[PDB]
């Protein structure tokens, strides 16, 4: 489900990735592993994903890990998604990624001070997979990063 989180709280979770960053990638190690994005932090490209200060990076996970995904969405106006899928790029302008293997369908968008996020758990086997934002045109201009799982 959706909850609220003020900026401190935002922050905080962000420093909850645990993923190593080398060059643009991400790397997850461990039985359980936290990935932590944010859908435009202020400052980075817009249309874009942040995951442990990286634009759109390509997450390494191990494959058989329990998989605690946690996503923000910080910009202001829009109600990004994060949906993982099989399907990659290039994406139409309203893509055609079904079906969805774990995602969180269309966020609200920051009000009062406070910003929504959800969780969800995924256990994926071994492959390559892509997150993507579904709002029309997004995905198209380069909103989704690659994980791969192995
Ligand atoms: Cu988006």
Redesign the pocket.
């Known amino acids: 489900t959706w909850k609220e989180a003020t900026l401190p709280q935002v922050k905080a979770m962000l420093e909850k990735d645990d993923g190593k960053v080398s060059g643009d990638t991400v790397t997850y190690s461990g039985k359980t592993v936290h990935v932590v994005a944010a ?1 435009v932090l202020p400052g980075f490209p817009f ?1 874009s994903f942040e995951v442990h200060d990286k634009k759109n990076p390509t997450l390494e996970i191990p494959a058989g890990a329990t998989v605690d995904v946690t996503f923000i969405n910080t910009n202001k106006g ?1 109600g ?2 994060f949906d993982i899928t099989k399907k990659g790029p290039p994406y139409a302008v309203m893509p055609v990624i079904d079906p969805i293997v774990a995602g969180t369908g269309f966020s609200p968008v920051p009000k009062d001070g406070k910003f929504g996020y959800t969780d969800f758990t995924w256990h994926p086997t071994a492959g390559t997979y892509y997150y993507v ?3 029309p045109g ?1 995905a198209a201009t380069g ?1 989704f990063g690659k994980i791969v799982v192995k």
């Open positions: 859908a249309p829009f990004h998604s934002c579904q709002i997004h909103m």
